[PDB]
Amino acid sequence: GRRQGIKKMEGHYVHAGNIIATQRHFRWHPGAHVGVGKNKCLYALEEGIVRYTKEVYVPHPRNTEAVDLITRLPKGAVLYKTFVHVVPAKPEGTFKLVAML
Amino acid sequence: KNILVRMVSEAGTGFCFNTKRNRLREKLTLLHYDPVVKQRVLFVEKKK
Amino acid sequence: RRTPPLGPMPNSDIDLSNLERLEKYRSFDRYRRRA
Amino acid sequence: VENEAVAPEFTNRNPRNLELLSVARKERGWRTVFPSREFWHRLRVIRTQHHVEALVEHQNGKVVVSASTREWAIKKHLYSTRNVVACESIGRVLAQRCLEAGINFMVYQPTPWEAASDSMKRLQSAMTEGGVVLREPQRIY
RNA sequence: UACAUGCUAAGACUUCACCAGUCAAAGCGAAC
RNA sequence: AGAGUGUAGCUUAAAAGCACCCAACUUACACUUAGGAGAUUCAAUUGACGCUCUGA
Numbered sequence: 001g002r003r004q005g006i007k008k009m010e011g012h013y014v015h016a017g018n019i020i021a022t023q024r025h026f027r028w029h030p031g032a033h034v035g036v037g038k039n040k041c042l043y044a045l046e047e048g049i050v051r052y053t054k055e056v057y058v059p060h061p062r063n064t065e066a067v068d069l070i071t072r073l074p075k076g077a078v079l080y081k082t083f084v085h086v087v088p089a090k091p092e093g094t095f096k097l098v099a100m101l
Numbered sequence: 102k103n104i105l106v107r108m109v110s111e112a113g114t115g116f117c118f119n120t121k122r123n124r125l126r127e128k129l130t131l132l133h134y135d136p137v138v139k140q141r142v143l144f145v146e147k148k149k
Numbered sequence: 150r151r152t153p154p155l156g157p158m159p160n161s162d163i164d165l166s167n168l169e170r171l172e173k174y175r176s177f178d179r180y181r182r183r184a
Numbered sequence: 185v186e187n188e189a190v191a192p193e194f195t196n197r198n199p200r201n202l203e204l205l206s207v208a209r210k211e212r213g214w215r216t217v218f219p220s221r222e223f224w225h226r227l228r229v230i231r232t233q234h235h236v237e238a239l240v241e242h243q244n245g246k247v248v249v250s251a252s253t254r255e256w257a258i259k260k261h262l263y264s265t266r267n268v269v270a271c272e273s274i275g276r277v278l279a280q281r282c283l284e285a286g287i288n289f290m291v292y293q294p295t296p297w298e299a300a301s302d303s304m305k306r307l308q309s310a311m312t313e314g315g316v317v318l319r320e321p322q323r324i325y
Numbered sequence: 326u327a328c329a330u331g332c333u334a335a336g337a338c339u340u341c342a343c344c345a346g347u348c349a350a351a352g353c354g355a356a357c
Numbered sequence: 358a359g360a361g362u363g364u365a366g367c368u369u370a371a372a373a374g375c376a377c378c379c380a381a382c383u384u385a386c387a388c389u390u391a392g393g394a395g396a397u398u399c400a401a402u403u404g405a406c407g408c409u410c411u412g413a
Binding site for chain 2: 328329330331332354355
């Protein structure tokens, strides 16, 4: 047992650097504020709540395998994949009165 | 087929590192980075 | 336990038997435009 | 003194406040899909069969500043609205508008072949000499 | 295949323990 | 003679978007790059100019 799978489910609060999922193959894709690793493990780049969505898959032009698979699609198909997002909770900062000069 | 060899820095002396090289290919010289002088310098092997 | 899809599942109307008769995506750009 | 009363919390509801301070977040993810959302403002060029569109948007998709050949004030000065000279013209007018909108840094992500396009080279060159930097500043953490 | 396969450092994963193992933001330094 | 009518090929497009052509790479196709032509039938919602169907 490799003990792979989703580590943090939907609606779960997440801190920066938390690992969301560990996968051998891209079962889930990095979405907003979710970074990937060498092991293709999805970690969180911000602090917030995890959401799982279905999004249109437009792969990178340099990815020749994904590119020609996209080409072989008819003019009826559009590829979809499951993405993982972190909706950030806290604002990135506040303005405080330091001194009255 | 391969040998674990060591290269010694020409500058920032006393700094060395290990790599692998083929048994048949010529003498191995690289351009590595050393933190002794914190710069990129050449490394030439001394012992396999 | 299966549940039926709520709305039109994507790639339903175009899902035809004869996939060799309808034209394909010749380019990456058109696939991107649509997506 | 009644004049000098300040809330210890200053609220600045300018949308572009934090971005101009290089502090606002960018969408860092999306490493497996083209294009990248890690930007603040994006230059998007839509080259259609008859016209050429140049767009400056936010991450929200809010179109901020547009330069279109489907616009009479410019269309009447081009022989053909789709060609390298039209692209240069659209880049020039877009840069002029962007300077006036307070936009000076943006990100342009073309396809590798679109980058190789001479029309896109002229577009980018015109935008650069316009005073717009086609590279966003790094976020401050 | 590569010679920054450098230095540091939040936060997490893990074969039911342990020992081992992974991933990594920011930063310094570098490519660009 | 009557009916349906009407934007370049197509549009529950509003002068737009895809269609389309040549030039370059390709054996070739395709991709891509650089160029080309395009249109709301004429008058005041209405009438008359063109097309299709049904008649002799």
